[PDB]
Coordinates of C-alpha atoms and ligand atoms in Angstrom, one line a residue:
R1 CA 7.6 -13.1 16.6
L2 CA 6.0 -12.6 13.2
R3 CA 2.8 -14.0 11.7
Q4 CA 1.7 -14.5 8.2
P5 CA 1.1 -11.5 5.9
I6 CA -2.4 -11.6 4.6
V7 CA -2.5 -11.3 0.8
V8 CA -5.5 -10.2 -1.3
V9 CA -5.9 -10.6 -5.1
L10 CA -7.3 -7.7 -7.2
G11 CA -7.8 -6.9 -10.9
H12 CA -10.3 -6.8 -13.8
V13 CA -12.9 -9.6 -14.4
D14 CA -11.3 -12.6 -16.2
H15 CA -7.7 -11.3 -15.9
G16 CA -7.1 -14.5 -13.9
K17 CA -7.4 -13.8 -10.2
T18 CA -9.2 -17.1 -9.4
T19 CA -6.9 -19.2 -11.6
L20 CA -3.8 -17.6 -10.0
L21 CA -5.0 -18.3 -6.4
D22 CA -5.7 -21.9 -7.4
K23 CA -2.4 -22.4 -9.1
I24 CA -0.5 -21.0 -6.1
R25 CA -2.4 -23.4 -3.8
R26 CA -1.7 -26.4 -6.0
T27 CA 2.0 -25.4 -6.4
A28 CA 2.3 -25.1 -2.6
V29 CA 0.5 -28.5 -2.0
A30 CA 2.7 -30.3 -4.6
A31 CA 5.9 -28.7 -3.1
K32 CA 4.9 -30.0 0.4
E33 CA 7.1 -32.1 1.5
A34 CA 6.0 -34.5 4.3
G35 CA 3.0 -33.4 6.4
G36 CA 0.1 -31.5 4.7
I37 CA -0.6 -27.8 4.9
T38 CA -2.9 -26.4 7.6
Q39 CA -6.2 -25.8 6.0
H40 CA -8.2 -22.5 6.6
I41 CA -11.8 -21.2 5.8
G42 CA -11.7 -18.8 2.8
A43 CA -7.9 -18.8 2.7
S44 CA -4.9 -20.9 1.9
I45 CA -1.5 -20.9 3.6
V46 CA 1.9 -21.2 1.8
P47 CA 4.4 -22.1 4.6
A48 CA 7.9 -20.6 4.8
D49 CA 9.7 -23.9 3.9
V50 CA 7.5 -24.3 0.8
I51 CA 8.3 -20.8 -0.4
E52 CA 12.0 -21.4 0.1
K53 CA 11.7 -24.7 -1.8
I54 CA 9.7 -23.1 -4.7
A55 CA 12.3 -20.3 -4.7
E56 CA 15.3 -22.8 -4.9
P57 CA 15.9 -22.5 -8.7
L58 CA 16.3 -18.7 -8.0
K59 CA 19.2 -19.3 -5.6
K60 CA 21.9 -17.4 -7.6
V61 CA 19.9 -14.3 -8.6
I62 CA 17.3 -13.8 -5.8
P63 CA 18.1 -15.7 -2.6
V64 CA 15.4 -16.1 0.1
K65 CA 15.9 -16.7 3.8
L66 CA 12.5 -16.2 5.5
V67 CA 11.6 -14.9 9.0
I68 CA 7.9 -14.9 8.3
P69 CA 6.3 -18.2 9.0
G70 CA 4.4 -18.2 5.6
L71 CA 1.8 -16.3 3.6
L72 CA -2.0 -16.4 3.9
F73 CA -3.8 -15.9 0.6
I74 CA -7.4 -14.9 0.8
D75 CA -9.2 -17.2 -1.5
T76 CA -12.1 -15.0 -2.5
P77 CA -10.6 -12.5 -5.0
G78 CA -11.8 -9.0 -6.1
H79 CA -12.8 -5.6 -4.9
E80 CA -16.0 -6.2 -2.8
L81 CA -14.0 -8.8 -0.8
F82 CA -11.1 -6.4 -0.5
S83 CA -13.3 -3.7 0.8
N84 CA -14.8 -6.0 3.4
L85 CA -11.4 -7.1 4.6
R86 CA -11.3 -4.1 6.8
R87 CA -10.6 -2.7 10.3
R88 CA -11.0 0.7 11.8
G89 CA -9.0 3.2 9.7
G90 CA -7.5 0.7 7.2
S91 CA -7.2 -2.7 5.6
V92 CA -6.7 -6.1 7.2
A93 CA -4.7 -7.2 4.1
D94 CA -1.0 -6.6 4.4
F95 CA -0.1 -7.0 0.6
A96 CA -2.0 -7.2 -2.7
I97 CA -1.4 -8.8 -6.0
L98 CA -2.9 -6.7 -8.8
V99 CA -3.5 -9.1 -11.7
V100 CA -3.4 -7.6 -15.2
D101 CA -4.0 -9.7 -18.3
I102 CA -0.7 -9.1 -20.3
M103 CA -2.6 -9.4 -23.6
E104 CA -5.3 -6.8 -22.7
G105 CA -3.4 -4.4 -20.4
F106 CA -5.3 -2.1 -18.1
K107 CA -9.1 -2.2 -18.0
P108 CA -11.6 -0.2 -16.0
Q109 CA -11.4 -2.4 -12.9
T110 CA -7.6 -2.2 -13.0
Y111 CA -8.0 1.6 -12.2
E112 CA -10.6 0.7 -9.5
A113 CA -8.0 -1.5 -7.9
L114 CA -5.3 1.2 -7.9
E115 CA -7.8 3.6 -6.2
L116 CA -8.7 1.1 -3.5
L117 CA -5.0 0.3 -3.0
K118 CA -3.9 4.0 -2.5
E119 CA -7.1 4.8 -0.5
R120 CA -6.3 2.2 2.1
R121 CA -2.5 2.4 1.7
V122 CA -2.0 -1.3 0.9
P123 CA 1.3 -2.1 -0.8
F124 CA 1.3 -4.3 -3.9
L125 CA 2.9 -5.8 -6.9
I126 CA 1.6 -6.4 -10.4
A127 CA 1.2 -9.9 -11.7
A128 CA 1.2 -9.6 -15.5
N129 CA -0.7 -12.7 -16.2
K130 CA -1.4 -15.0 -19.2
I131 CA 2.1 -14.8 -20.7
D132 CA 1.5 -18.2 -22.2
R133 CA -1.1 -16.6 -24.6
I134 CA 1.7 -14.6 -26.3
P135 CA 1.7 -15.9 -30.0
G136 CA 4.6 -18.4 -30.4
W137 CA 5.0 -19.0 -26.6
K138 CA 6.6 -22.4 -25.9
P139 CA 5.8 -23.2 -22.3
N140 CA 8.2 -24.5 -19.7
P141 CA 5.6 -25.4 -17.0
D142 CA 6.3 -24.2 -13.4
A143 CA 9.6 -22.6 -14.4
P144 CA 10.8 -19.3 -13.1
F145 CA 10.1 -16.4 -15.3
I146 CA 13.8 -15.6 -15.7
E147 CA 14.4 -19.2 -17.0
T148 CA 11.5 -19.6 -19.4
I149 CA 11.9 -16.1 -21.0
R150 CA 15.4 -17.2 -22.2
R151 CA 13.9 -20.3 -23.8
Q152 CA 11.5 -18.2 -26.0
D153 CA 12.0 -17.0 -29.5
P154 CA 13.2 -13.4 -30.0
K155 CA 9.8 -12.3 -31.4
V156 CA 8.0 -13.8 -28.3
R157 CA 10.3 -11.9 -26.0
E158 CA 9.8 -8.7 -28.1
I159 CA 6.0 -9.0 -27.6
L160 CA 6.4 -9.6 -23.8
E161 CA 8.6 -6.5 -23.6
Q162 CA 6.0 -4.5 -25.5
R163 CA 3.1 -5.6 -23.3
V164 CA 5.1 -5.0 -20.1
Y165 CA 5.8 -1.5 -21.3
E166 CA 2.0 -0.9 -21.8
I167 CA 1.6 -1.6 -18.1
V168 CA 4.6 0.5 -17.1
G169 CA 3.2 3.4 -19.2
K170 CA -0.2 3.3 -17.5
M171 CA 1.5 3.1 -14.0
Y172 CA 3.9 6.1 -14.6
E173 CA 0.8 8.0 -16.0
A174 CA -1.1 7.3 -12.7
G175 CA 1.8 8.6 -10.5
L176 CA 3.0 5.1 -9.5
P177 CA 6.5 4.3 -10.9
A178 CA 6.6 0.5 -11.8
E179 CA 9.1 -1.7 -13.7
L180 CA 9.8 -5.3 -14.6
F181 CA 10.9 -6.8 -11.3
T182 CA 14.3 -7.8 -12.5
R183 CA 15.3 -4.1 -13.2
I184 CA 14.3 -2.7 -9.7
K185 CA 17.1 -1.9 -7.2
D186 CA 15.1 0.0 -4.6
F187 CA 11.7 -1.8 -4.0
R188 CA 10.6 1.3 -1.9
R189 CA 10.8 3.4 -5.0
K190 CA 9.2 1.2 -7.7
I191 CA 6.3 -1.3 -7.9
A192 CA 7.4 -4.7 -9.1
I193 CA 5.8 -6.2 -12.4
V194 CA 6.1 -10.0 -12.3
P195 CA 5.1 -11.7 -15.6
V196 CA 3.3 -15.1 -14.8
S197 CA 1.0 -17.7 -16.2
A198 CA -1.7 -18.8 -13.7
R199 CA -2.2 -21.6 -16.3
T200 CA 1.3 -23.1 -16.8
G201 CA 2.9 -21.9 -13.5
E202 CA 5.6 -19.9 -15.2
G203 CA 6.8 -17.1 -13.0
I204 CA 5.1 -18.4 -9.9
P205 CA 8.5 -18.9 -8.2
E206 CA 9.4 -15.2 -8.5
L207 CA 5.9 -14.1 -7.6
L208 CA 6.2 -15.9 -4.3
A209 CA 9.8 -15.0 -3.6
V210 CA 9.0 -11.3 -4.3
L211 CA 5.9 -11.3 -2.2
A212 CA 7.8 -12.9 0.7
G213 CA 10.7 -10.6 0.4
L214 CA 8.7 -7.4 0.2
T215 CA 6.4 -8.3 3.1
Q216 CA 9.1 -9.5 5.5
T217 CA 11.4 -6.6 4.7
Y218 CA 9.0 -3.7 5.2
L219 CA 6.1 -5.0 7.2
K220 CA 7.8 -6.4 10.3
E221 CA 5.9 -4.1 12.8
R222 CA 2.5 -4.7 11.2
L223 CA 3.1 -8.5 11.1
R224 CA 4.1 -8.8 14.8
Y225 CA 2.0 -11.2 16.7
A226 CA 0.7 -10.1 20.2
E227 CA -0.8 -12.7 22.5
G228 CA -4.3 -11.7 23.5
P229 CA -7.9 -12.0 22.6
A230 CA -8.7 -12.3 18.9
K231 CA -9.3 -9.3 16.7
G232 CA -11.0 -10.0 13.3
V233 CA -13.4 -9.2 10.6
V234 CA -16.4 -11.0 9.2
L235 CA -16.4 -11.6 5.5
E236 CA -19.5 -13.8 5.1
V237 CA -22.6 -14.8 7.0
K238 CA -24.3 -18.0 5.9
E239 CA -26.2 -21.2 6.8
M240 CA -24.3 -24.4 7.5
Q241 CA -26.0 -27.7 8.0
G242 CA -25.6 -28.8 11.7
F243 CA -24.4 -25.4 13.0
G244 CA -27.1 -22.8 12.0
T245 CA -25.9 -19.3 10.9
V246 CA -22.1 -19.2 10.9
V247 CA -19.7 -16.4 10.1
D248 CA -16.5 -16.8 8.0
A249 CA -13.9 -14.5 9.4
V250 CA -10.3 -13.5 9.2
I251 CA -8.4 -13.2 12.5
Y252 CA -5.6 -10.6 12.1
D253 CA -4.4 -10.5 15.8
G254 CA -4.5 -12.6 18.9
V255 CA -6.2 -16.0 19.5
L256 CA -9.8 -17.1 19.2
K257 CA -10.9 -20.1 21.2
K258 CA -13.9 -22.4 21.6
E259 CA -16.0 -21.0 24.5
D260 CA -14.8 -17.4 24.0
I261 CA -17.3 -14.6 24.4
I262 CA -17.3 -12.7 21.1
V263 CA -18.6 -9.2 20.3
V264 CA -19.6 -8.7 16.7
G265 CA -21.1 -5.8 14.7
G266 CA -24.8 -6.4 13.6
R267 CA -27.5 -4.4 11.9
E268 CA -29.1 -3.4 15.2
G269 CA -25.9 -3.0 17.2
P270 CA -23.1 -5.0 18.7
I271 CA -24.0 -8.6 19.3
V272 CA -22.6 -10.4 22.3
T273 CA -22.5 -14.2 22.0
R274 CA -20.2 -17.1 22.8
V275 CA -18.4 -19.5 20.4
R276 CA -19.9 -23.0 20.3
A277 CA -17.5 -24.2 17.6
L278 CA -14.5 -23.1 15.5
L279 CA -14.6 -24.9 12.1
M280 CA -11.7 -25.5 9.6
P281 CA -11.5 -27.7 6.6
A282 CA -10.4 -31.3 7.4
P283 CA -6.7 -32.1 6.6
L284 CA -6.2 -33.0 2.9
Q285 CA -4.2 -36.2 3.7
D286 CA -7.2 -37.6 5.7
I287 CA -9.0 -40.4 3.7
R288 CA -12.4 -39.0 4.7
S289 CA -11.6 -35.7 2.9
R290 CA -12.8 -37.0 -0.5
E291 CA -16.0 -35.9 1.2
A292 CA -16.0 -32.1 1.6
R293 CA -15.3 -32.2 5.3
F294 CA -14.8 -29.9 8.3
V295 CA -13.2 -30.4 11.7
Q296 CA -13.7 -28.5 14.9
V297 CA -10.6 -26.9 16.5
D298 CA -9.9 -25.6 20.0
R299 CA -8.4 -22.4 18.8
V300 CA -7.0 -20.4 15.9
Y301 CA -4.2 -17.8 15.9
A302 CA -3.6 -14.8 13.7
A303 CA -3.4 -14.9 10.8
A304 CA -6.4 -17.3 10.2
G305 CA -9.4 -17.9 8.0
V306 CA -12.0 -19.5 10.3
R307 CA -15.6 -20.4 10.5
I308 CA -17.4 -19.5 13.7
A309 CA -20.6 -21.1 15.1
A310 CA -22.4 -19.2 17.8
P311 CA -26.0 -18.3 18.3
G312 CA -27.5 -15.0 17.4
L313 CA -25.4 -14.2 14.3
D314 CA -28.3 -13.8 11.8
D315 CA -28.0 -9.9 11.9
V316 CA -24.2 -9.8 11.3
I317 CA -23.2 -7.8 8.2
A318 CA -20.1 -8.4 6.0
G319 CA -17.3 -6.1 7.0
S320 CA -18.1 -6.1 10.7
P321 CA -15.4 -6.3 13.3
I322 CA -15.4 -9.3 15.6
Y323 CA -13.5 -9.3 19.0
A324 CA -13.0 -12.0 21.5
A325 CA -13.7 -10.9 25.1
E326 CA -12.1 -12.5 28.2
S327 CA -14.9 -11.4 30.5
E328 CA -18.3 -9.7 30.5
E329 CA -16.5 -6.5 31.5
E330 CA -14.2 -6.6 28.5
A331 CA -17.2 -7.4 26.2
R332 CA -19.0 -4.3 27.5
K333 CA -15.9 -2.2 26.5
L334 CA -15.6 -3.9 23.2
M335 CA -19.4 -3.1 22.5
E336 CA -18.5 0.6 22.7
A337 CA -15.5 0.1 20.3
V338 CA -17.7 -1.8 17.8
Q339 CA -20.5 0.8 18.0
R340 CA -18.0 3.7 17.5
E341 CA -16.5 1.9 14.5
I342 CA -20.0 1.2 12.9
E343 CA -21.0 4.9 13.4
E344 CA -18.2 6.1 11.2
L345 CA -19.6 4.0 8.4
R346 CA -23.4 4.2 8.9
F347 CA -24.5 7.7 9.7
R348 CA -27.0 10.5 8.9
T349 CA -26.5 14.2 8.9
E350 CA -28.2 17.5 8.1
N351 CA -25.5 18.2 5.5
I352 CA -26.3 19.0 1.8
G353 CA -24.9 15.8 0.1
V354 CA -25.7 12.6 -1.7
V355 CA -27.6 9.6 -0.1
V356 CA -25.5 6.4 -0.2
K357 CA -27.0 3.0 0.3
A358 CA -25.1 -0.3 0.1
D359 CA -25.3 -4.0 1.1
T360 CA -22.1 -4.5 3.2
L361 CA -20.0 -2.3 5.4
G362 CA -16.9 -2.6 3.2
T363 CA -18.6 -1.4 0.0
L364 CA -20.4 1.3 2.0
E365 CA -17.1 2.5 3.3
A366 CA -15.4 2.3 -0.1
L367 CA -18.3 4.2 -1.7
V368 CA -18.2 7.0 0.9
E369 CA -14.3 7.2 0.7
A370 CA -14.5 7.4 -3.2
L371 CA -17.0 10.3 -2.9
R372 CA -14.9 12.1 -0.3
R373 CA -11.8 11.7 -2.5
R374 CA -13.7 13.5 -5.3
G375 CA -15.0 16.2 -2.9
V376 CA -18.7 15.0 -3.0
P377 CA -20.4 15.6 0.3
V378 CA -22.4 12.7 1.7
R379 CA -25.6 13.4 3.6
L380 CA -26.1 9.9 4.8
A381 CA -24.7 6.4 4.4
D382 CA -26.5 3.2 5.5
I383 CA -27.2 -0.4 4.8
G384 CA -30.2 -1.7 2.9
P385 CA -32.9 -1.0 0.3
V386 CA -33.6 2.6 -0.9
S387 CA -36.6 3.8 1.2
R388 CA -39.0 6.7 1.0
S389 CA -37.0 8.4 3.8
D390 CA -33.8 8.1 1.7
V391 CA -35.4 9.8 -1.3
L392 CA -36.7 12.6 1.0
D393 CA -33.2 13.1 2.4
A394 CA -32.0 13.5 -1.2
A395 CA -34.9 15.9 -1.8
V396 CA -33.7 18.1 1.1
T397 CA -30.3 18.2 -0.7
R398 CA -31.9 18.7 -4.1
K399 CA -33.7 22.0 -3.1
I400 CA -30.2 23.4 -2.3
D401 CA -28.0 21.8 -5.0
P402 CA -29.7 19.5 -7.6
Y403 CA -26.3 18.1 -8.6
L404 CA -26.1 16.5 -5.1
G405 CA -29.7 15.6 -4.6
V406 CA -29.6 11.9 -5.6
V407 CA -29.5 8.4 -4.2
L408 CA -26.5 6.2 -5.1
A409 CA -27.7 2.6 -4.5
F410 CA -25.0 -0.1 -4.5
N411 CA -26.5 -3.7 -4.9
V412 CA -29.7 -3.0 -3.0
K413 CA -33.3 -3.0 -4.1
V414 CA -35.3 0.2 -4.4
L415 CA -38.7 0.0 -2.7
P416 CA -41.8 1.0 -4.7
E417 CA -42.5 3.8 -2.2
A418 CA -39.1 5.2 -3.1
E419 CA -39.7 4.9 -6.8
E420 CA -42.9 6.9 -6.4
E421 CA -41.3 9.7 -4.3
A422 CA -38.2 10.1 -6.6
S423 CA -40.5 10.6 -9.5
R424 CA -42.6 13.2 -7.6
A425 CA -39.4 14.9 -6.2
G426 CA -37.2 14.9 -9.3
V427 CA -34.6 12.9 -7.4
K428 CA -32.5 10.5 -9.5
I429 CA -31.7 7.0 -8.1
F430 CA -28.5 5.5 -9.5
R431 CA -28.3 1.7 -9.2
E432 CA -25.2 -0.4 -9.9
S433 CA -23.3 -3.4 -8.6
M434 CA -19.7 -2.2 -9.3
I435 CA -18.4 0.8 -7.4
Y436 CA -16.5 2.5 -10.2
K437 CA -19.6 2.3 -12.4
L438 CA -21.9 3.8 -9.9
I439 CA -19.4 6.7 -9.4
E440 CA -18.8 7.1 -13.2
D441 CA -22.6 7.1 -13.9
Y442 CA -23.1 9.8 -11.3
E443 CA -20.2 12.0 -12.5
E444 CA -21.4 11.7 -16.1
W445 CA -24.9 12.8 -15.2
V446 CA -23.4 15.7 -13.2
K447 CA -21.4 16.8 -16.3
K448 CA -24.4 16.7 -18.5
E449 CA -26.6 18.6 -16.0
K450 CA -24.0 21.3 -15.7
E451 CA -23.7 21.5 -19.5
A452 CA -27.5 21.8 -19.6
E453 CA -27.4 24.8 -17.2
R454 CA -24.7 26.6 -19.4
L455 CA -26.8 25.9 -22.6
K456 CA -29.7 27.8 -20.9
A457 CA -27.5 30.9 -20.8
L458 CA -26.5 30.4 -24.4
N459 CA -30.2 30.0 -25.5
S460 CA -30.8 33.4 -24.1
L461 CA -29.3 34.3 -27.6
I462 CA -30.2 33.9 -31.2
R463 CA -27.7 31.3 -32.3
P464 CA -26.1 30.7 -35.7
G465 CA -28.2 28.6 -38.1
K466 CA -28.1 27.9 -41.8
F467 CA -30.6 26.0 -43.9
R468 CA -31.7 25.2 -47.4
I469 CA -35.2 25.4 -48.8
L470 CA -35.8 21.9 -50.2
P471 CA -36.9 21.6 -53.9
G472 CA -40.4 20.1 -53.9
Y473 CA -41.3 21.0 -50.2
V474 CA -43.0 24.4 -50.4
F475 CA -46.2 23.8 -48.4
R476 CA -47.3 27.4 -48.3
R477 CA -45.9 30.3 -50.2
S478 CA -46.7 33.1 -47.7
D479 CA -48.5 34.5 -44.7
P480 CA -47.0 32.4 -43.2
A481 CA -44.5 30.9 -45.6
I482 CA -44.2 27.1 -44.9
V483 CA -41.2 25.3 -46.4
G484 CA -39.3 22.1 -46.1
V485 CA -35.7 22.7 -45.1
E486 CA -32.5 20.8 -44.4
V487 CA -30.4 22.3 -41.7
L488 CA -26.8 22.7 -43.1
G489 CA -25.2 23.9 -39.9
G490 CA -25.8 25.4 -36.5
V491 CA -29.3 25.6 -35.1
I492 CA -32.8 26.9 -35.6
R493 CA -35.4 27.5 -33.0
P494 CA -38.9 29.1 -33.0
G495 CA -38.7 32.9 -32.7
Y496 CA -35.4 33.3 -34.6
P497 CA -35.2 36.1 -37.2
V498 CA -34.0 34.8 -40.6
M499 CA -32.3 36.5 -43.5
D500 CA -31.1 35.6 -47.0
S501 CA -27.6 34.9 -48.1
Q502 CA -27.2 38.7 -48.8
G503 CA -28.3 39.5 -45.3
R504 CA -31.7 40.9 -46.2
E505 CA -34.4 40.4 -43.5
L506 CA -37.2 38.0 -44.5
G507 CA -39.1 37.3 -41.3
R508 CA -39.0 35.1 -38.2
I509 CA -39.5 31.5 -37.4
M510 CA -43.0 30.9 -36.1
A511 CA -42.8 27.1 -35.9
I512 CA -40.6 24.0 -36.7
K513 CA -42.3 20.7 -37.2
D514 CA -41.5 17.0 -37.8
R515 CA -43.9 14.6 -39.6
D516 CA -44.8 13.7 -36.0
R517 CA -44.5 16.9 -33.7
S518 CA -43.5 20.5 -33.1
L519 CA -39.8 21.0 -32.2
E520 CA -38.1 23.5 -30.0
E521 CA -34.9 23.1 -32.0
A522 CA -33.5 21.6 -35.2
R523 CA -29.8 20.9 -35.8
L524 CA -27.3 19.9 -38.6
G525 CA -28.9 17.3 -40.9
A526 CA -32.5 17.8 -39.7
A527 CA -35.1 17.9 -42.5
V528 CA -38.1 19.8 -41.0
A529 CA -41.0 22.1 -42.0
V530 CA -40.3 25.7 -41.0
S531 CA -43.2 28.2 -40.8
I532 CA -41.9 31.8 -41.3
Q533 CA -43.8 34.8 -40.2
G534 CA -43.2 38.1 -42.1
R535 CA -43.0 39.6 -45.6
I536 CA -41.4 36.4 -47.1
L537 CA -43.1 35.2 -50.3
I538 CA -41.6 32.0 -51.7
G539 CA -40.9 32.5 -55.4
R540 CA -40.1 36.2 -54.8
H541 CA -37.8 36.8 -51.7
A542 CA -36.5 33.2 -51.7
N543 CA -36.7 30.2 -53.9
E544 CA -36.5 26.4 -53.7
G545 CA -32.8 25.5 -53.3
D546 CA -31.9 28.8 -51.6
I547 CA -29.9 29.0 -48.4
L548 CA -31.2 31.0 -45.4
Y549 CA -29.4 32.1 -42.3
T550 CA -30.4 33.1 -38.7
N551 CA -30.0 36.8 -38.2
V552 CA -27.7 36.8 -35.2
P553 CA -27.4 40.2 -33.5
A554 CA -23.8 41.6 -33.4
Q555 CA -23.8 41.6 -29.5
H556 CA -24.9 37.9 -29.6
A557 CA -22.1 36.9 -31.9
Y558 CA -19.6 38.6 -29.5
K559 CA -21.0 36.7 -26.5
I560 CA -20.9 33.3 -28.3
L561 CA -17.2 33.8 -29.3
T562 CA -16.1 35.2 -25.9
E563 CA -18.3 33.1 -23.4
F564 CA -19.7 30.0 -25.2
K565 CA -17.0 29.3 -27.9
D566 CA -16.2 25.9 -26.4
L567 CA -19.9 24.9 -26.1
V568 CA -21.3 25.4 -29.6
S569 CA -20.6 23.0 -32.5
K570 CA -17.7 23.4 -34.9
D571 CA -20.5 23.7 -37.6
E572 CA -22.3 26.4 -35.4
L573 CA -19.0 28.4 -35.5
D574 CA -18.6 27.9 -39.2
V575 CA -22.1 29.4 -39.7
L576 CA -21.3 32.4 -37.5
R577 CA -18.2 33.0 -39.6
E578 CA -20.5 32.9 -42.7
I579 CA -23.0 35.3 -40.9
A580 CA -20.2 37.7 -39.9
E581 CA -18.9 37.7 -43.5
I582 CA -22.5 38.3 -44.9
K583 CA -22.7 41.2 -42.4
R584 CA -19.3 42.5 -43.4
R585 CA -20.0 42.7 -47.1
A586 CA -23.4 44.4 -46.4
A587 CA -21.3 46.9 -44.4
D588 CA -23.4 46.3 -41.3
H589 CA -22.6 48.9 -38.6
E590 CA -22.9 46.9 -35.4
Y591 CA -21.1 43.9 -36.9
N592 CA -18.2 46.2 -38.0
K593 CA -17.9 47.5 -34.4
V594 CA -18.1 44.0 -32.8
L595 CA -15.6 42.6 -35.3
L596 CA -13.1 45.4 -34.5
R597 CA -13.8 44.8 -30.8
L598 CA -12.9 41.1 -31.3
Ligands
LIG601 N1 -4.2 -19.1 -21.1 C1 -4.4 -18.6 -19.9 N2 -5.6 -18.5 -19.4 C2 -5.8 -18.1 -18.2 C3 -4.7 -17.7 -17.3 N3 -5.2 -17.3 -16.2 C4 -6.6 -17.4 -16.3 N4 -6.9 -17.9 -17.5 C5 -8.3 -18.1 -18.0 O1 -9.0 -16.9 -18.1 C6 -10.3 -17.1 -17.7 C7 -10.6 -16.2 -16.5 O2 -9.9 -16.7 -15.3 P1 -10.4 -16.3 -13.8 O3 -9.4 -16.9 -12.9 O4 -11.8 -16.8 -13.7 O5 -10.4 -14.7 -13.8 P2 -11.0 -13.8 -12.7 O6 -12.4 -13.4 -13.2 O7 -10.0 -12.6 -12.7 O8 -11.0 -14.5 -11.3 C8 -10.5 -18.6 -17.4 O9 -10.9 -19.3 -18.6 C9 -9.1 -19.0 -17.1 O10 -8.9 -20.4 -17.3 C10 -3.3 -17.9 -17.9 O11 -2.3 -17.6 -17.3 N5 -3.3 -18.3 -19.2

């Protein structure tokens, strides 16, 4: 027999994940029928008969005969939750809905979702949400998409088609063929796009029918229920009045019972305890449920969202496995299974790599997997605040490869000891609370650090520079000449030889100064005071308003154009072209040879 597919909801903030979950629940509850729907902790069921009923208006186009008993929707949406809905080597979710706001299209978290989905090989569909916000939309509440779209004005349907294509485009670009669900023949070959309104209920019938069809067709083996002790995962650890520290878990195989011995992953190792109570929300029909109310149950079966009361759960961490054990002997075996699972996620090595700290097992796993996907070695991965030890581990890495010698801290504090050491060691600590942002911030830094290293090689050379002596800013006429200039292109640095617009040598830059400070460099648009050491006498060899150039050696011009061409500014290249031409007209020997060479 089959059990319920477990469905998770992803997508960018405010694209409507929460509204969509709530609308699905309400629609199910309204569609039921006679007796209420079985209530779960952190999750809502849509039974088989309710889906078939909701699907009835589709009878002609998309029929639905169900062999799954229903769908379990996880009621906490988003990507941290999804990452904590985990088991060894994969997800506990069986299907995802990726919500995209049809009016906005893909946003940064939409790409995060796609990565998380391929990484853990979770199948999905796209819910193109907020269709009711299309200008001129005339809602038909709760109606199938296929019916309401035919009751819109031609311009409204045009916009919808345009906005769906925006999604289609991004998907093909990402390597994932996707189409409006109506146009798909082979649902193995193409991801379904279902336009919906979490607000009006439009398209909810096809959403559910497509979910049901895709899960029952392709996931039969994964969905098979085997009788035996519970396997599950902990999503949340918290206080509950009258029960102490409880865990909220999803059971994905077997049966969990009151009095069962459980083994659950904790900060200090596998915890062995015994279930005192299994809590579920009270039935909604019950008159005492106006009060937010819980009832104890004897048992729950996969798939279930359940709250577990048992002593000693304080040290549990989100994303930990939880197993029922039939005997002490079985619990001892399960302790080793748990510890081996936890060691894959929390580890330390002598490898040259980044230091990863996070707050839950799920996000720690997803962070490590994202780095691995990109080829970034990971020295250690663990739970909790960034400590002095973490910084010193990244310092070991830093000495070998500075681009890897960092701490990536996901939603954890950094201790003052660690702040102090990072400063002394030159180790950067990255702090963020969204995974893609942590990763992007690190990658961006790496790009800029690598660019800085190339620029060192370029600054071995006298670079192209062009600047005008400002009328009214001659501070000193000679020995050294000191003049206000505007940089018209390229760059000037202390030590650069300079020449006039005819290529005659005037001297060399002794100093470049702001109104505030001495500068190592000045670039396009800078107005600075340049001290020039040499024979230069202002009024004689150059005048106010005259344009001066750096005297780039021929060999240096060659290397800029053949090794650093992509790195210098367009304006820097413009100036080198001016310089090469000044040199050409002067009949400069070495420039003539380098230009022929080029
Ligand atoms: N007009 C319209 N608004 C929506 C729809 N779905 C969500 N919203 C609104 O968009 C906002 C964000 O929704 P929410 O479910 O919190 O997005 P989440 O951050 O992805 O969980 C809220 O104001 C919702 O009422 C929809 O289909 N149509």
